[PDB]
Amino acid sequence: TVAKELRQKSSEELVKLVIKLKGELLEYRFKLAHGELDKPHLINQTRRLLATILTILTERKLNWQEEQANEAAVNAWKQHLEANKAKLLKSRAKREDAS
């Protein structure tokens, strides 16, 4: 199951595969932190997967790094800054009225 990875786009598709594996490995470990991970065997495999892929991008002269070359979030942040406007405006008005 390595010669089936040499044949892939050993320059560029492997980078996308690497980032996908890192993401799903992270989500695996997070699932392991709580409960609901019923196949604890997937971690050891997926790490084992990356070990081969990097081994290719290291036999070839390349690197996993530098191959790279908010639905309600923005609304919530806008509300935050608007509240900051209100507080700052209220504070400035009280200071200028006092003088």
Partner: protein, 92 residues
């Protein structure tokens, strides 16, 4: 941006007590060498919510298993709590 700096979340009674409020302070354990800038950038690129404030503490190792013929030492970990704006909440 390897996002190897989000090792694990911790679920304790204190975390739930602080989380059910309005600020929704999540918590994570991060690389012992990581810093708040890397933590908040990693959070940005792992979930999608730019975090408001980040706090870090570290639990220094102590003696573990006490007297059991093979006494040992605990684990050095940096816990970072992550705050979020009022009307937002995400899960792991």
């Amino acid at each position: 941006d390897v996002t190897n700096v989000l090792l694990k979340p911790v679920l304790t009674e204190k975390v739930y007590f602080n989380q059910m409020g309005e600020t929704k302070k999540y918590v994570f354990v991060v690389n012992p060498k990581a810093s708040k800038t890397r933590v908040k950038l990693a959070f940005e690129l792992v979930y999608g919510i730019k975090p408001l404030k980040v706090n870090t503490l570290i639990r220094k190792p102590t003696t573990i298993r006490g007297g059991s013929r093979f006494p040992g030492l605990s684990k050095l970990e940096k816990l970072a709590v992550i705050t979020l704006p009022k009307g937002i909440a995400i899960s792991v």
